[model samples]
Target: MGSWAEFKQRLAAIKTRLQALGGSEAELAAFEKEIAAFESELQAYKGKGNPEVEALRKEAAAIRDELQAYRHN
Candidate 1:
């Protein structure tokens, strides 16, 4: 599925979004910490992943784009 690439891209996108988000460094820090774990987890997959990876994709994407407070407008 080449989802390893997709996973990397998604993580990068979240990190970028987190950086753009201001007024709460603590919030940013929290996500950053978890992002590191996610990054390592992704690395453990090493260009291959399982169905649960897709679940994280959905969950991470939700956290990235589904939050009401994440509105930039």
Candidate 2:
């Protein structure tokens, strides 16, 4: 598992991608807001994350996936 700083950095990268999409600003804002909420929840875990973390990981990955909506090769 990565430290919180690394995790936030990953989120930031995804945010940059969302911003690049141009026409989906609302969705991008939603994603960023969700990420921020998730970060706060994760921070409250006090170092021992439960299985729910997997879901959060997947959610974050999904945002990243959306960011790369092309390149079908």
Candidate 3:
């Protein structure tokens, strides 16, 4: 989930984690929620590269990292 394609693909298959994930649903959804954020904010796109994209990637990546231990069980 590091590159744009991988990031988006991760979230694309991410929704099913509703059951597969053991973290707080709130936190799990937080990742998905960020996707919608990009979706809408993406409409005014300046060619798919923006300041928010970087941070959002971090947010998404960090979120997964924090939630990383759950499935480790």
What are the RMSDs of all candidates, in order?
Answer: 9.4, 9.6, 10.0
Q: For residues 1-68, what per-residue lDDT tens digits would candidate 3 score against the true structure? A: 23455546655555566446556555465655655565565535445666646665565555555554
Name the TM-score of candidate 2: 0.37
Which scores better on lDDT, 1 or 3?
1
lDDT of 2 by residue, 1-73 (tens): 4555555576677556565566565445555566666657775655756564655667675765564452221
Per-residue lDDT tens digits of candidate 1, residues 1-31? Answer: 5656666676676657565656445445456
TM-score for each candidate, following the candidate numbering: 0.37, 0.37, 0.32
* CA lDDT, every model vs. true structure: 0.59, 0.58, 0.55
lDDT of 3 at 35: 56
The CA-based lDDT of model 2 is what?
0.58
Lowest-lDDT window of 10 residues in candidate 1?
Answer: 64-73
Candidate 3 residue pairs that clash: none
